[PDB]
Amino acid sequence: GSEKPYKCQECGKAFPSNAQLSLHHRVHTDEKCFECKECGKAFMRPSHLLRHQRIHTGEKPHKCKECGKAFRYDTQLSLHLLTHAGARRFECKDCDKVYSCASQLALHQMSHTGEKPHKCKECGKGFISDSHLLRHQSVHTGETPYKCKECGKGFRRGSELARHQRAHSGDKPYKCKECGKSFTCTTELFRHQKVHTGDRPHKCKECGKAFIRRSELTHHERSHSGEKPYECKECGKTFGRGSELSRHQKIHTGEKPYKCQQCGKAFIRGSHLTQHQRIHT
DNA sequence: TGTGGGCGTGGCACAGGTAAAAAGGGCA
DNA sequence: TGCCCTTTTTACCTGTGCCACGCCCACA
Ligand SMILES: [Zn+2]
Ligand SMILES: [Zn+2]
Ligand SMILES: [Zn+2]
Ligand SMILES: [Zn+2]
Ligand SMILES: [Zn+2]
Ligand SMILES: [Zn+2]
Ligand SMILES: [Zn+2]
Ligand SMILES: [Zn+2]
Ligand SMILES: [Zn+2]
Ligand SMILES: [Zn+2]
């Protein structure tokens, strides 16, 4: 198992990213270097290190002079003061947001103009940044550096290994306020909550009924068209969705999966066993 | 009574956009 | 060494493909 896969071939310290490792390996390469206490990262100025340490210490020295709210970073206080009057404001020409200086207004407005300079060598797609392109390389690489300490299962993101380990331990800390069913991660709870909202953004143009997912709209449209693109290799049957084919194929394998006490009848589905449980109640 | 497909949603490993943190640095 | 920013990396967020259940109804 490895929640931090990027290990130093010089000291063995563990880091969750190549970038973080890269800025630790200053300790052993750079002559003029400044290392942090517990996290073991290095910086090329005391200014920088001391700034970084406020992450551990929780100090917030940059204090607003008229409302008094402290902040961790000059970055942050600078954005805050846009809220009071008498601040140099960089309003977005298009949307409604506002930025403290010009370099970040420019970076935002890359989201309108669609500029994506770092072009992927393989699919030719583009990204707002080098580290994003690095992220997208998961698609061509199929690597899984994050590894479960219980089963050694592989994951592309430490996020996902986290949710998996929560699954192992049965830790579902996201509860649906209305229903009560819990969830290992935040996306699962989000898609569920869509059932209470009635947030069904995909609408059948023909019929009118609305769905949660794009795939359901597809399967509905084909269920009006009659197109069943999923064929059995053995018996030649048709299906609209792959799950119905996969569940079908268990008829071809001898299964006899479930059974009932004192008569032993075998049913391919679990719910069938209930229907037969009604017989002798 | 027994089958079995259509339908709707849960589990899960996952990509990609953007808001936010975090690092980089010229210079007084 | 902090100002005053620029630039890079990460968190937060929202959507998605594939697979499998349980439910409802049509028939056999
Ligand atoms: Zn090292
Ligand atoms: Zn640190
Ligand atoms: Zn204020
Ligand atoms: Zn805008
Ligand atoms: Zn690519
Ligand atoms: Zn595991
Ligand atoms: Zn609920
Ligand atoms: Zn329809
Ligand atoms: Zn078949
Ligand atoms: Zn029985």
Q: How far is the CA of A127 from the C1' of B26 (A)?
A: 28
Q: Give the integer Cα–Cα distance in Å for A235 and A13.
A: 58
Ligand nearest to the CA of A164: 6
Protein residue at shortest CA distance from C1' of B1: A276
Protein residue at shortest CA distance from C1' of C11: A159
Superfamily of domain A146-197: Classic Zinc Finger (3.30.160.60)
Q: Give the integer Cα–Cα distance in Å for A270 and A258.
A: 7
Q: Give the integer Cα–Cα distance in Å for A239 and A227.
A: 8
- Please check whether the domain covering A6-57 is classified as CATH 2.40.50: no
Report phi then psi at A6, rounded to 5.
Answer: -100, 95
Of A42, A17, A14, the residue nearest A28 (C-alpha): A42
- CB-CB contact of A73 with A51 (8 Å): yes
Distance A112 CA to ligand 4 centre (A): 6
Q: Identity (one letter) of the amino acid at A269?
A: R
Q: How was this structure determined?
A: X-ray
Q: Give the integer Cα–Cα distance in Å for A218 and A248.
A: 21
Q: Give the integer Cα–Cα distance in Å for A70 and A74.
A: 10
Hey, what are A188's tokens?
A: 């699962």
Hey, what are A229's tokens?
A: 């693109």
Cα A48 from chain centre: 30
* Extents of the domains making up chain A: 6-57, 146-197
Q: Which phi-psi region, left, alpha or beta, contains residue A172 (left: φ > 0; alpha: ψ -120 to 50)? A: beta
Same fold, A6-57 and A146-197: yes
A76 touches strand C (CB under 7 A): no
Using the CA of A278, which nucleotide's C1' is the nearest one?
Answer: B1
Q: How far is the CA of A237 from the C1' of C15 (A)?
A: 32
A168 touches strand C (CB under 7 A): no
Q: What is residue A10's three-state secondary structure?
A: coil
- CB-CB contact of A148 with A8 (8 Å): no
Q: Give the integer Cα–Cα distance in Å for A12 and A23.
A: 14
- CB-CB contact of A122 with A140 (8 Å): yes
Distance A236 CA to ligand 9 centre (A): 6
Distance A272 CA to ligand 8 centre (A): 30
Write the CB contacts of A51 (distance below 8 Å, at least 6 apart in sequence): A73
Q: Give the integer Cα–Cα distance in Å for A158 and A17.
A: 10
Q: End-to-end CA distance of chain A, in Å? A: 49
Q: Give the integer Cα–Cα distance in Å for A267 and A218.
A: 32
